[PDB]
Scaffold this motif. Structure first.
Motif, mmCIF file in Angstrom:
data_model
loop_
_atom_site.group_PDB
_atom_site.id
_atom_site.type_symbol
_atom_site.label_atom_id
_atom_site.label_comp_id
_atom_site.label_asym_id
_atom_site.label_seq_id
_atom_site.Cartn_x
_atom_site.Cartn_y
_atom_site.Cartn_z
ATOM 1 N N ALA A 23 -11.061 -6.420 -5.379
ATOM 2 C CA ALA A 23 -10.906 -5.002 -5.580
ATOM 3 C C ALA A 23 -9.981 -3.980 -4.959
ATOM 4 N N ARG A 24 -9.641 -4.991 -3.615
ATOM 5 C CA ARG A 24 -8.350 -4.438 -2.358
ATOM 6 C C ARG A 24 -7.262 -5.175 -3.414
ATOM 7 N N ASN A 81 -14.815 -15.261 -3.173
ATOM 8 C CA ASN A 81 -15.934 -14.551 -2.164
ATOM 9 C C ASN A 81 -16.182 -13.210 -2.340
ATOM 10 N N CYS A 82 -15.901 -12.135 -1.815
ATOM 11 C CA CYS A 82 -15.799 -10.864 -1.696
ATOM 12 C C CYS A 82 -15.339 -10.112 -3.379
ATOM 13 N N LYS A 83 -16.503 -9.079 -3.716
ATOM 14 C CA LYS A 83 -16.148 -8.083 -4.739
ATOM 15 C C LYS A 83 -14.378 -7.230 -4.231
ATOM 16 N N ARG A 84 -15.051 -6.959 -2.605
ATOM 17 C CA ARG A 84 -14.590 -5.721 -1.886
ATOM 18 C C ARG A 84 -13.206 -5.746 -1.894
ATOM 19 N N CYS A 85 -12.491 -6.940 -1.406
ATOM 20 C CA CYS A 85 -11.703 -8.152 -1.626
ATOM 21 C C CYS A 85 -10.433 -8.343 -2.993
ATOM 22 N N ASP A 110 -8.072 -17.950 -4.907
ATOM 23 C CA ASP A 110 -8.747 -18.199 -3.923
ATOM 24 C C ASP A 110 -9.955 -18.564 -4.469
ATOM 25 N N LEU A 143 -3.410 -10.594 -0.384
ATOM 26 C CA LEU A 143 -4.217 -11.411 -0.143
ATOM 27 C C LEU A 143 -4.461 -12.805 -1.119
ATOM 28 N N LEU A 168 -2.440 -13.177 3.565
ATOM 29 C CA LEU A 168 -2.612 -12.405 4.844
ATOM 30 C C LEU A 168 -3.986 -13.668 5.636
ATOM 31 N N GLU A 201 0.266 -1.398 -0.076
ATOM 32 C CA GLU A 201 0.102 0.084 0.016
ATOM 33 C C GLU A 201 0.807 1.318 0.046
ATOM 34 N N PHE A 202 0.343 2.228 -1.006
ATOM 35 C CA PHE A 202 1.601 3.625 -1.056
ATOM 36 C C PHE A 202 2.406 4.051 0.621
ATOM 37 N N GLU A 211 -13.137 -19.300 -2.334
ATOM 38 C CA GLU A 211 -14.240 -18.756 -2.021
ATOM 39 C C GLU A 211 -14.701 -17.529 -2.972
ATOM 40 N N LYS A 224 -1.138 -4.417 -8.179
ATOM 41 C CA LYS A 224 -0.427 -3.568 -8.648
ATOM 42 C C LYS A 224 1.125 -2.611 -7.921
ATOM 43 N N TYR A 225 1.241 -2.394 -6.243
ATOM 44 C CA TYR A 225 2.312 -2.064 -6.254
ATOM 45 C C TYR A 225 3.054 -2.926 -6.401
#
Ligand SMILES: [Zn+2]
Lengths: 302, 72, 288, 63
Positions: free
Chosen positions: A238-239, A232-236, A228, A223, A264, A193-194, A230, A245-246
């Motif tokens: 996106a994370r 599962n999570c569209k949010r994870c 993975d 992540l 994680l 993370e930046f 599952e 990226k980094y």
């Protein structure tokens, strides 16, 4: 290329001083822990000490055991011992048993740093002597805020103004060991993370200026959402894209570095058993495909 | 004088605070910890103002000297 | 207590200068955007400008429209206009022993250049703006300049500084996320602005999860994250009491286009509520 | 020749600064971080040149 793990350090026999540092909630402690454990298991012949100055006193939380001033063997291990110690309390007591001191000292950088440090060292030696047993390598769980080691410039600023001793002579002793890449090294902890990365370079640069070897970055909380099951999570997901990226940036920027990309484990890692299970991936890099279950099994217990 | 007396007091309180804050977990006590930091950046101002006043209470006393001899 | 939104600012008529700043990937841009939109809608009588110096040139990405040097009305809006501008390119075109060294010099020159450019936009258009919203660059110190051509400068700066010190005239809005490292950077920033005598009263806290009030209650990982986020909210709360801290929700993926930017910017005005407002977000994501 | 170079450094450093201010550090962390490393270098080179000149005064002045 350079290997994407810390295998060469875990197996090294030349190192007396390994520092683990990381600002801002990035895994630092379970990293300190994980390294210590791996070294100990990999080198059963040697005696290891995990010492921590972090005020959160969380070696005790990690191990779910209560350590403190007195170096104590980690339960269920025979070469790893831990002490949690607050250096301010140690330094303050020395001043006690011993406002004018502050006009000259208080101001100068690394002075209080060095005094504090020397105090820790002294304390360790006292532990070995009484025990009759000595440690072969210490692993420093550094404090997440400050500049524990900015006293490694004192010997330079103190000879300058000496022309214009006990301490400066100690520091030059230390600095001699800490400049030996085969003797001592630093391990940076961060997350993809930046803001953390930035803080990480700042740190690397600072260590380089002290002439401390720094060769290894641990990148926690990754992540691997692609691999993975599952999914599962569209949010994870996106994370994971940011994190990724980094990674790509980190890769082309610390090429000659050992950058370990740790997974994680959701929630918390406590106790020798799980800390161990988890610390394996610092040696042989984690692989989301084959190693998945190991993590999903650590979480699902939690 | 009273300016040095205070400068020392500040320089000392600031120090004592510093060491106390170094025993707090900034991540587990962000509010408290951040507060104490704000108090330090204050004291550094107070202490750098006292230091500047003293340096200029020298220039003030010192002007009363060269005035004496060579004003003559 | 102080309201947990930016309603008083969005409705304010006294402000000419609103700065939006935030280091490290925290929502800054869609925040700049969201404020601009809400202001414009709330005050249809006034003319607003969103100007951005961010090198990522991402007002254009946010709006999915292509803005640039030339102030242009945001399509589908009649009082919001946007310009993306790189000040280095502006300063360089105008062009070290004396200048290069001194802080805020290049900052101020660069700034003055922007100002000049704006004025040129109004004159030619025959139309003037009532309030600008600055999408500040994520790294640097754009405004550390607030501390014959010599005099010329210092006289300009003192003119500026006079408007920027008026709390009714100009204010700063910090963006951050509920995470130690960002919070820290955030205080650092507040402190710095306070030193410049700039009004700073408002923090936007982006990417919050509200995992408790979520019907998917899916990801054990995002739950665990939500606990951190929460943990710090509680700290932020007792530390910036007299502040307007807006706790914005995480819309997963990306917010683009006037429509969604709008839908989303409503929660800067009337604080988001996971219970009643959930769908609004789940509807923004599920389209994505 | 020392002044001549000091100006050249001071100028290259400046030009680099402004070029980096046009790059997105979040979208170009590698590139951007590199250029920053180059700057912290030039500041050293430029502060060494400046120190040598100041001491090429002390050297001439002693004569
Ligand atoms: Zn999730």
């Amino acid at each position: 290329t350079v290997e994407p793990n810390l295998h060469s350090l875990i197996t090294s026999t030349t190192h007396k001083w390994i520092f683990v540092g990381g600002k801002g909630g990035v895994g630092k402690t379970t990293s300190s822990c994980s390294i210590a454990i791996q070294m100990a298991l990999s080198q059963p012949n040697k005696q290891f000490l995990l010492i921590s100055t972090d005020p959160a006193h969380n070696l005790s939380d990690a191990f779910g055991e209560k350590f403190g001033k007195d170096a104590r063997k980690v339960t269920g291990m025979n070469n790893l011992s831990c002490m949690e110690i607050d250096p301010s309390a140690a330094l303050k007591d020395m001043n006690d048993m011993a406002g004018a001191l502050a006009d000259l000292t208080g101001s100068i950088p690394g002075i209080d740093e060095a005094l504090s440090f020397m105090e820790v060292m002294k304390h360790i030696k006292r532990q070995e002597q009484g025990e009759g047993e000595t440690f072969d390598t210490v692993i420093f769980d550094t404090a997440p805020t400050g500049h524990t080691l900015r006293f490694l410039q004192l010997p330079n600023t103190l000879s300058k103004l000496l022309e214009k001793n006990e301490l400066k002579a100690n520091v030059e002793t230390i600095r001699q060991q800490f400049t030996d890449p085969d003797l001592t090294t630093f391990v940076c902890v961060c997350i993809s993370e930046f803001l953390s990365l930035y803080e990480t370079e700042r740190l690397i640069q600072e260590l380089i200026s002290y002439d401390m070897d720094v060769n290894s970055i641990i990148v926690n909380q990754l992540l691997f959402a692609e691999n993975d099951q599952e999914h599962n999570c569209k949010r994870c997901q996106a994370r994971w894209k940011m994190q990724k990226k980094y990674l790509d940036q980190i890769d082309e920027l610390y090429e000659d570095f050992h950058v370990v990309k740790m997974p994680l484990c959701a929630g918390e890692i406590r106790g020798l058993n799980n800390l161990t299970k988890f610390s394996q991936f610092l040696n042989k890099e984690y692989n989301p495909i084959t190693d998945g279950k190991v993590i999903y099994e650590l979480e699902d217990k939690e | 004088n009273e300016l040095s007396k205070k400068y020392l007091a500040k320089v000392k309180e600031r120090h004592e605070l510093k060491e106390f804050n170094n025993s707090i977990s900034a991540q587990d006590n962000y509010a408290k910890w951040t507060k104490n930091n704000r108090k330090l950046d204050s004291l550094d101002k107070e202490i750098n103002n006292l230091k500047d006043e003293i340096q200029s209470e020298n220039k003030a006393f010192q002007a009363h000297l060269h005035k004496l001899e060579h004003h003559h």
